[model samples]
Target chain A: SGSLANNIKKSTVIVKN
Target chain B: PTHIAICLYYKLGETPLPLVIETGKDAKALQIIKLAELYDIPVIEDIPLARSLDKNIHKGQYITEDFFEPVAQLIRIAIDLDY
Candidate 1:
């Protein structure tokens, strides 16, 4: 029901953070 | 002063997704910076890009096609970091 799991399940980028 | 940080989630079929926007220097922003790092999320600093993401895209919304190239670059970098 969400964008899905972060870094693990999908490609995630934390800009400046 | 505030330091703004934004996160974008991407996948092959779906449109890019906005995750979280953290704004603060020694506080939440940096705090989140460290947090994300532990999770192995690639963190890059570009004031211009972060500013645009925080302002133009709504949290939990898909970004515009104009943002596609930049986010693809971000995705590319993250892939590089893994290998």
Candidate 2:
């Protein structure tokens, strides 16, 4: 769950790079 | 005034099964569908979590039903069945 949670979080996170 | 999730709650909602609706000027539409990655022969794939950092303070909002569903599905698949 942690891994999946992180993935979802990361996916939602967007940096203007 | 800043927007608020009107039907939101920490333990109880002001309404039942609320349909999420968001509106903002600076909001970026980050489509989350099919955003995960898979690697070769790895027991598990790398996961990236989202956070909102203003200057230094990190922040996160309540996860809506749409986001929750995918997260729950992926977690179940990875943990219960070793995906």
Candidate 3:
């Protein structure tokens, strides 16, 4: 499976500045 | 001329996955560079560096530890720029 895609989604959330 | 734009999108205390955009036309590359700038993302325009990274990094994956130095330097620049 493409775990890379999963990680992308996992980390894409915008963090408050 | 051919151009490439590499953006290192990351937050503090986390590894970054480089987003690579390659274009045969300068306009396309400039468009992506502008997009990153609009979002305050850090942009590095090293064709050789981008080529190396593109081969080693998979989309959605953090860059391998072997490239820590180069990527870290870029990240530090991003931090310094507060982008």
Candidate 4:
């Protein structure tokens, strides 16, 4: 079962602005 | 400089699709693209194409002939843009 939280984490980038 | 900007070039027959340029760091990548824009170079924003090119093409080498068609299509787009 997939969750929105998991997808959110994947959407994040390690690079900073 | 973790980020990288890569440019591919295509020419007439037998010549490889050279990875003509690369620059690192987010700021540098932006700078390079900005310069390209200033020079009227076509800047394509295709994430999947970038990923594929980054993974398969080395910094100073040509990609396989298998990729020729796709890469050619990309070049065609740029050519059509006439930038």
Candidate 5:
């Protein structure tokens, strides 16, 4: 089902933060 | 550093308007750069209908530190008073 690779792929930076 | 970044509700406001920038300390100096230097820049710091002071903490709405622009505005207002 869910995997660590999937979690990392979904995360992105919103702005300079 | 954590999920706390999500709890913050922040808004940004930018305005495009005629502004003056003052350069020299003397009021009578005249030039494009000087005029720009003399003209003051005004930013929409306050949110409409918000009970907040410009420099007060917990105001919920405020402007960025516009130290340079405010100084120009003050100088222009001061010099114009002589007329």
Candidate 6:
């Protein structure tokens, strides 16, 4: 769960909710 | 001031891949431009294609099957000039 969120944050161009 | 915008987060890793989709109506366009610049991701501005993606795909999802070609063709231009 922790790593998954990080991947989204780290990998994404813009952080969307 | 009001418009749809999107980012197709492509990175040339072991494979070139669209990482994720990020979008909104406000400074999202600015964010797209800035974040891309900061991260060294390439972007070409096109509202029709931008708007289409904004409407058809939800934020933070892989692009729908139809847009794969549309996005791929844009990438083709960048690679095509690899000389």
Best by DockQ: 1
Model 1 lDDT per residue over B1-83, tens place: 37766666665566435444333344656655766766677888887877787777765667777777887788788754434
Please state every model's RMSD to the true fold in angstroms.
Answer: 4.5, 13.3, 8.0, 13.9, 20.2, 5.9
TM-score of chain B as predicted in candidate 3 = 0.63
Q: What is the C-alpha lDDT of each candidate?
A: 0.62, 0.26, 0.47, 0.49, 0.22, 0.55
Q: Give the candidate order by descending DockQ.
A: 1, 6, 2, 3, 4, 5
Q: How many backbone clashes does every candidate have?
A: 0, 6, 0, 0, 8, 0
Docking class of 1: acceptable
Tell me each candidate's i-RMS in Å.
3.9, 14.2, 8.8, 15.3, 18.8, 6.1
Q: Check candidate 1 and list the clashing pairs.
A: none
Which residue segments of model 4 deviate by more than 4 Å? A1-17, B1-4, B18-20, B23-25, B80-83
When sorted by lDDT, best at the front, the candidate numbers are: 1, 6, 4, 3, 2, 5
DockQ of 6: 0.13
Collision pairs in model 5: B20-B39, B20-B40, B21-B36, B21-B37, B21-B38, B21-B39, B22-B37, B22-B38
lDDT of 4: 0.49
Q: Chain B TM-score per candidate, please.
A: 0.72, 0.23, 0.63, 0.69, 0.18, 0.66
Q: Can you write out model 4's per-residue Cα lDDT over B1-83, one digit (the tens) per residue?
A: 34445565554583445433442347756665655555555666556656666666654476677666766665666653226
Write the number of the candidate with greater DockQ, choosing between 2 and 6. 6
TM-score of 5: 0.16
Cα deviation in Å at residue B64, candidate 5? 9.3
After TM-score superposition, the amount by which residue B41's alpha carbon in candidate 6 deviates from its true location, in angstroms, is 1.4
lDDT of 4 at B41: 56
TM-score of chain A of each: 0.19, 0.50, 0.43, 0.38, 0.44, 0.43
* Cα shift from native, residue B38, model 6 (Å): 1.8
For candidate 2 chain B, which ten residues in a row score worst on lDDT? B1-10
Candidate 6 chain B, poorest ten consecutive residues by summed lDDT: B13-22
Candidate 5: C-alpha lDDT:
0.22
Which runs of model 2 end up more than 4 angstroms from their true locations?
Answer: A1-17, B1-59, B80-83
By lDDT, who's the top model here?
1
Give candidate 5 regions above 4 Å deviation: A1-17, B1-65, B80-83
- Model 3 agreement with the true structure over B3-53: per-residue lDDT tens digits: 544434556455444432222135644655555545555555556666666
**Between candidates 2 and 4, the lDDT winner:** 4
